[PDB]
Ligand binder design. Structure first.
Ligand SMILES: CN(Cc1nnc2c(=O)[nH]ccn12)c1ccc2nccnc2n1
Length: 167
């Protein structure tokens, strides 16, 4: 038993809710919140900008030190950093950005990072300003992640389309 509430169950291990991931994180304090990161950990907009703003920019400060030491992430890769006031840990995961021409096949590699964590609160990777089809992203999530994932979808309209079209 865990503290996630109001989710619809899509499969054995994948759950979904119309929710703002920032508010959901502050209420649940999950062990892991996933950020929709870029390789530079520049949290300017989308989910990343929202999460970083909620940390009063502490996420960005920590991220800049990480990059200065380690260099950029790979598309499809991840790193574990602090969750600040939102979660114990933040798993920064880089899905391909279609608006940068990155290969959509890397979306599966991106979701494989979730399997290193037993339970996660996450957004749909490569959705939103990353330009992928969220229905495709949900399909890859379900077909790749084997650990317990709680997907927060900010847009109610999109949430309804995702549920109603789910096979
Ligand atoms: C309504 N939105 C934005 C949005 N608002 N909240 C969320 C969320 O929570 N996850 C992902 C997206 N998203 C759309 C709609 C069509 C899209 N078609 C292709 C890529 N992105 C798209 N985004």
């Amino acid at each position: 038993v865990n503290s996630f509430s109001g989710y619809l169950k899509l499969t054995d291990n994948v759950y979904i809710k119309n929710a703002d991931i920032v508010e959901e994180a502050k209420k649940v304090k999950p062990t892991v919140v996933v950020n929709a990161a870029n390789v530079y950990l520049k949290h300017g907009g989308g989910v990343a900008g929202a999460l970083n703003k909620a940390t009063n920019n502490a996420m960005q400060v920590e991220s800049d030190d990480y990059i200065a030491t380690n260099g950029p992430l790979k598309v499809g890769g991840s790193c574990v950093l602090s969750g600040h006031n939102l979660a114990k840990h933040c798993l920064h995961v880089v899905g391909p950005n279609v608006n940068k021409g990155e290969d959509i096949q890397l979306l599966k590699s991106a979701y494989e990072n979730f399997n290193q964590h037993e339970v996660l609160l996450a957004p749909l990777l490569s959705a939103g300003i990353f330009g992928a089809d969220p229905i495709h992203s949900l399909r890859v999530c379900v077909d790749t992640v084997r650990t317990n994932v709680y997907l927060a979808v900010f847009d109610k309209n999109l949430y309804d389309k995702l549920v109603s079209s789910f096979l």
